[PDB]
Symmetry: D2
Amino acid sequence: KCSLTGKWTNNLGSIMTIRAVNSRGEFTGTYLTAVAANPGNITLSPLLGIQHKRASQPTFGFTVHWNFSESTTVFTGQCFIDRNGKEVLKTMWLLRSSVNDISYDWKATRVGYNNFTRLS
Amino acid sequence: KCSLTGKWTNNLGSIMTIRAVNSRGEFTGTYLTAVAANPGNITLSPLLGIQHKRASQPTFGFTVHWNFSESTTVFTGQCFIDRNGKEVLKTMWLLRSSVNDISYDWKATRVGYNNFTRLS
Amino acid sequence: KCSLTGKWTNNLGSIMTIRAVNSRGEFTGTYLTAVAANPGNITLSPLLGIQHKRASQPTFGFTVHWNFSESTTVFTGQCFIDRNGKEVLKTMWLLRSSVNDISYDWKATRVGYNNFTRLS
Amino acid sequence: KCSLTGKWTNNLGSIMTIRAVNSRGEFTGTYLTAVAANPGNITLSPLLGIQHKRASQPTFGFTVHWNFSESTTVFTGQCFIDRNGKEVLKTMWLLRSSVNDISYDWKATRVGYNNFTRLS
């Protein structure tokens, strides 16, 4: 089985720490991105999400409120376990930037992927 | 200022109800989707997310844990206020399906948009 | 049957003109975007794509090579015919920006939607 | 400099062959996917796209008309060269499925990534 609780890194070098997942699958944590619009100002940012509880390889989602910009990122994906018991989070994300008014909305959303593995 | 608290409907007919937004911008609520893979199964499902607090037109994200499938959806977007004071949520979403193993991961994520306005 | 040949406009005000669709479903045309990173620079830009041929409501894709930037956009979607014979193209797109090197790749892709209807 | 001409594989084991890129950056090719909705019926499928010509690390897009389903995929990305002269295509894609009518459009588009390297 695949809890999101613990410490993770991704293919870009970011790290995230997730606290205990509650009975509803809800979790909180802290995200340190290796990458931003401007790296010189990166600070720790809170995350909040929900995973499925019963599934051995659950799907999940979470939101990161960036504490150093007006942007928000959401991640969704699935936790997989291989034959050796090794976990990987396979995720896709959307990064929403703040734009001035609705006529700029079209350009406000970036998309990408991330693969996370457990630290230690 | 744009607070996500309240009831909203989107362009597909779905309805969501967001409760109080806390000091950190965290919020919970429920989501009744008009659409699903198997609509006969649809039930009210919980959401959890974070919005920015200081901005008049905040970005935000939330996760919906579907209570009737193994899937998860994340939404991110921005709340805009027009010159008449009307609020629109412009969002993009990712819908993560559960797949049996990692070899099927490539096909597990759908993408789309939704525009939300207030029920009343 | 839905042939992409003709002039179309989208929900952002952009206009495109598609030429004859060949036996394979290949088509070329031009795209005049209403929106860009630097709108002062916008010029008419070429597109090239393929639609399915046998289907009444074909899926399709096309690439727009922006003639005024280093970016590229791809659109994919489906042409629907409603009960009155009116055609709508429902599309999603990815806009790829040029970045200086691979360390910036993560932020180079935007996503969005567009709905197109015929000019006349 | 980064021509798309040649033979490529991606992280899912798919292979594609691209013919000579013309003076406008247009190219044709053939795509053999390792993965589909149903693999037992996979056949070679044509692709058609445009790359930028002047840039050393050009952006590009192309469309794959699947010859064994009603779907279409578009890819966009950038060709990067490292210090050793090794090329990688970093791409994102949208896979459009055919749905019966416009009320099902919401679920019709999958998103993902692929990294391609040159064969040989």
